[PDB]
Amino acid sequence: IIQRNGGRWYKFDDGDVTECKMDDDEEMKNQCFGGEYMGEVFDHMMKRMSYRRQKRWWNAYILFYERMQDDELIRYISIERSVRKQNVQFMHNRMQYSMEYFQFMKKLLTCNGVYLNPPPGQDHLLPEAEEITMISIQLAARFLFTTGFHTKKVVRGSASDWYDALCILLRHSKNVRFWFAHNVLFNVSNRFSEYLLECPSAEVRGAFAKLIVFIAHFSLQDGPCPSPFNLSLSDHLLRAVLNLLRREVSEHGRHLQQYFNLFVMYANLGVAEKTQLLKLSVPATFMLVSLDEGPGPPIKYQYAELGKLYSVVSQLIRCCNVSSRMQSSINGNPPLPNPFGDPNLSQPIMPIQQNVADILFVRTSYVKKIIEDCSNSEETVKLLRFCCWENPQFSSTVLSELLWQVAYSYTYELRPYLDLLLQILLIEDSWQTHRIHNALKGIPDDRDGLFDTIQRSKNHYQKRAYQCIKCMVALFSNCPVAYQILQGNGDLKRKWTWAVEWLGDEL
């Protein structure tokens, strides 16, 4: 359509109004004049060219011509309200989401920050900065949890910055930290669910999780918070976060990495937190999950990323006392001290608790799960090397599972398993000789050994036997005790021969 102006054409398609370059006659041919044309077709990843006769299925349909506000047409012969109201609303709602409104909120909240530090000879804020924090936390709560975190990244702008802005207010003051929890977290009964699991944005879940860690941490020295349905605030926050395992965690797979960093980062703090986590049976309820035996339905998503559910249990268990569960192999000797526990920590927090021991030691479902799934990580090696240490039955369980996967698993994923096998054989305790024995011979009448899987796979799946040799070559060259078992046991010595020529001949 032409616009009647005092000094053009425009593009009018549906609700879109833009400028157009059809003043040139070539564009008139391209869009409205239609017709058949010799077309150019590119296909086959831009490698094949062919020319096709194409019809311009876009073409002019109805045309209007204008001859070169008449009072006669208004003469007889025989509201601005709705316009205003929707115009008013759009002006109002345009400003709420304007990009420079968000940069206004940051300045309003992050300013006065230099006034928010407590006096150096005091561990709390004087009346003024107490009230400045009180007012600002009211607005930061109002803005962020109504329209702040839901706005798109282009305007909302890296919600970690909002977490930094919230950190300035929330710390250094107790009542403010109490106000926030009891007014924007323990009032909705869906706050933790919608922001940790339901939110389809990595930054927002991460920023919210880091916020819960922050509030729970700095509320440890605070007094007993009232129960929101002698418990501190961090006691309530973890309880509410753990209440998601009942139904929502099962419903909301594919959003879980940031739900478990709430516990991964809450453990990387110190000993006062790990003690709290252990007393909540966090490891005990987390091994049940990923076994689908937890307090609720199983996780419904196939490729759920539980890699941080294991790293919490790994860190939490490697703070306990397995003293009552080691056997010394060489009879009479005492069990060796554990050199694979927690560094940055003097003495075990508590004896390893019962229900955890019944899932890790007595049973063997968990050990299957972490070895099968989370083998490439390094929080599993630390848990295995901490439990396999002079534990005869457990060290067999890990070998039973590892020998199963090195044999009966898919040929392209052996390296995560084989490389994990080393740091189980390279444990220099009183049971080391057995582990090299029950990895080369195999546990009899069920699981093969490193030599047995080689025989089973020379003809077909030759890549399986090759990767097994790489493990063995690496083990012998870097383990002396392995060399005196290879050199000293003729059968293993003799089998090791046939292995080396086969690798050569296949090459």
Added chain:
Amino acid sequence: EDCSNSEETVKLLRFCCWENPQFSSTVLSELLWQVAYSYTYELRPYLDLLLQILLIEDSWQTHRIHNALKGIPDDRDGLFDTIQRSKNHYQKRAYQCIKCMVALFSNCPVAYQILQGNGDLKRKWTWAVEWLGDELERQSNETSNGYFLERSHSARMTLAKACELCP
């Protein structure tokens, strides 16, 4: 072992494996043992009997279906495990275990409200079916003698019927 493909054995097992966790544990324990340690062609009757134990609509049906796919607890005696034994060799044992499952989900709603809704099985189910699809691309029935797979019509339509259960 002996009277498996008869009609009065299924009737007795179905009569005692009703609301009886102890008995149904033994019947599944033995059947899963016989599914593992048997000739790939003498295996058809045992699976066909396994279905009819799973399709008993008592209160333990979900429990019974669980301890047939995962396995008798913390042991590697289960349908998804016997597939893993015989995935590189004796491949006819895995296919018949898969064809058992295909006939299970397609005929038991409660067995399809576990597969779609548990994830880990649904992960392993995807692992099994993709292997079958990769095995039929690298003529007598698989329920007869042979060693590798015998890529017949029996398989190629149970593979196409498997890949409509895994979305």
Added chain:
Amino acid sequence: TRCCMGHRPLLFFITLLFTVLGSTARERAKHSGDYFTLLRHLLNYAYNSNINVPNAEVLLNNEIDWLKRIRDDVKRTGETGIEETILEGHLGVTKELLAFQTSEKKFHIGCEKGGANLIKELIDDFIFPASNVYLQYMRIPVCGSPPTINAGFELLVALAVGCVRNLKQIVDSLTEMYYIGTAITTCEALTEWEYLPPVGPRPPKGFVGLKNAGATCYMNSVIQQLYMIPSIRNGILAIEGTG
């Protein structure tokens, strides 16, 4: 900053520039942009480096007078009587110059019963005049451009820094405009996790289209063609009493 190593050269400039005002500084009105931003830089260096400007308050009170009249400019015309870049700086200079006042000032300006209620002004005259219409309905901004919309904000923030009595009003007012509708006891949400206004800004030289329901293209195109006709547009809207 560096070559002076002394608190003398800047004062000569400070006065020098503040000397130029709605004189030649107004005359350019397009090249004064780089003038104004420097003016912040020198004033900013004065505060953070604890350099005391002699003539602080006297200059500042003129800016309120400067901003008060132009508040009436739109109130009298509907279009601002100054160019956009001058408003950029006169708001910007007010910020840095607002730093050289105590909390007894900076509240005698904002929230004061007898003072020039400048926090009231920027809220409901410069930046959010539309929301006041909307709130009155639940019963033309001076800053139009995004650079000028911004400029009203860091002035608002500077009114709250170090003054809880001014911060309270700014935070209170923002509640009754945007977050009183629901956030009285509970904080609801938009329920859409990546939300923007779905209508759009209606670019000025652009025009208002018509939404399509999926198969209403045939009727949308007809209406667009009919409205542009000056006779149809003027004549039909003149047909009164159709309700």
